[PDB]
Design a binder for this molecule. Structure first.
Ligand SMILES: N=C(NO)NCCC[C@H](N)C(=O)O
Ligand SMILES: O=C(O)CCC(=O)C(=O)O
Ligand SMILES: [Mn+2]
Length: 348
């Protein structure tokens, strides 16, 4: 049974906030996950997003497949299209990344992954943006609490998330139809926090921290976490529960905390009925570099946008977005923007 916490609306650094931050860290260190209570508006926005997802998934495959972009990874992923650890995953997905028109300077500059969401319609757009605004408010609360729990300045993590590269996967898992039960293979996600919601069906499993168990650093090309531990216990079933979102760390928190927090491995198994879920990623700015918090002399860094881009290219090797990155050599822009960007997101 997972811990469930109610977060304060504002985090100021008072003793109660520090205490809550300590408890969140302890819950992640024991269970790998906790739940946060939703209020009526958070719940309403969650349910409206789930409803919009169900309606979109009923549309014809040709229409769903048209919701793609060769500039951004936002848009539709068919069942069987994404790859995890060399094997196809079976949800159909709509990914929402930062919604930037071709009038945005980063898009004009050809920055990888920057472009407009191919929304299926404007009611879907509004439902997802409203939900993501609420999710982001929670993400910022969680990051301030986490800083306080580690005895860090309250803004330590939020100083990296201004115009953060927040994104969301809006998922529908089919019922199991063959001998294959795999929904999504074991993996870790890539940013600071994952905040997730699900319907009543059930299928998400997470791996808690295991004493002595070494964890791959998924930001290194030589240590992908995809597939790791797939068939080894322990795996905790995330029981569907009304009125909560779940929260677990992503790769950036594992790196920055030197493993004091671990990016929680997780997987999804198909059930006897279709399953709707949404996974939200509260991320650094695309241009931000994560750094080790507890080793000031350590020179290792993670350029967040580079990690995102690498990951999405490995998930979607044949997507038009990936093809255009390769064709126009957009990973070069990525090394160039490190030194010549004029967004003022980083640097003097
Ligand atoms: N968070 C994302 N974005 O595509 N996918 C999660 C599944 C794992 C992903 N396919 C990987 O190989 O790492
Ligand atoms: O289906 C879920 O509950 C979570 C799916 C997930 O891990 C993801 O999309 O990254
Ligand atoms: Mn995931």
């Amino acid at each position: 049974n997972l811990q469930t916490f109610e977060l304060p609306t504002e985090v100021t650094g008072c003793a109660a906030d520090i205490s809550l931050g300590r408890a969140l860290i302890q819950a992640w260190q024991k269970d790998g996950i906790f739940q946060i209570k939703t209020d009526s508006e958070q719940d309403r926005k969650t349910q409206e997003a789930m409803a919009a997802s169900k309606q979109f998934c009923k549309e014809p495959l040709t229409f769903k497949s048209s919701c793609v972009s060769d500039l951004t990874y936002s848009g539709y992923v068919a069942s069987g299209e994404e790859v995890t650890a060399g094997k196809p995953d079976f949800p159909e997905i709509f990914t929402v990344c930062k919604d930037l028109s071709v009038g945005d300077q980063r898009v004009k500059a050809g920055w990888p992954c920057h472009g407009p969401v191919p929304w299926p319609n404007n009611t879907y757009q509004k439902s997802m943006k409203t939900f993501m605004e609420e999710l982001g408010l929670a993400g910022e609360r969680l990051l301030k609490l986490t800083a306080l729990g580690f005895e860090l300045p309250i803004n330590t993590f939020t100083d990296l998330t201004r115009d953060g590269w927040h994104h969301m996967r809006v998922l529908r898992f089919p019922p199991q139809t063959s001998t294959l039960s795999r929904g999504i293979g074991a993996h870790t996600d890539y940013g600071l926090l994952v905040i997730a919601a699900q319907d009543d069906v059930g299928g998400l499993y997470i791996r808690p921290p295991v004493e002595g168990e070494k964890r791959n650093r998924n930001w290194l090309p030589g240590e992908s976490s995809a597939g790791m531990f797939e068939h080894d216990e322990p795996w905790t079933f995330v029981t569907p529960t009304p009125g909560v979102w779940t929260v677990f760390p992503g790769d950036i928190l594992q790196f920055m905390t030197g493993g004091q927090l671990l990016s929680t491995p997780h997987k999804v198994k198909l059930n006897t009925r279709e399953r709707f879920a949404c996974a939200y990623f509260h991320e650094p700015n695309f241009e931000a570099s994560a750094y080790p918090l507890f080793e000031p002399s350590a020179n290792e860094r993670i350029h967040y946008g580079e990690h995102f881009t690498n990951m999405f290219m490995r998930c979607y090797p044949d997507r038009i977005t990936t093809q255009r990155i390769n064709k126009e050599n957009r990973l070069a822009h990525l090394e160039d923007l490190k030194k010549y960007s004029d967004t003022r997101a980083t640097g003097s």
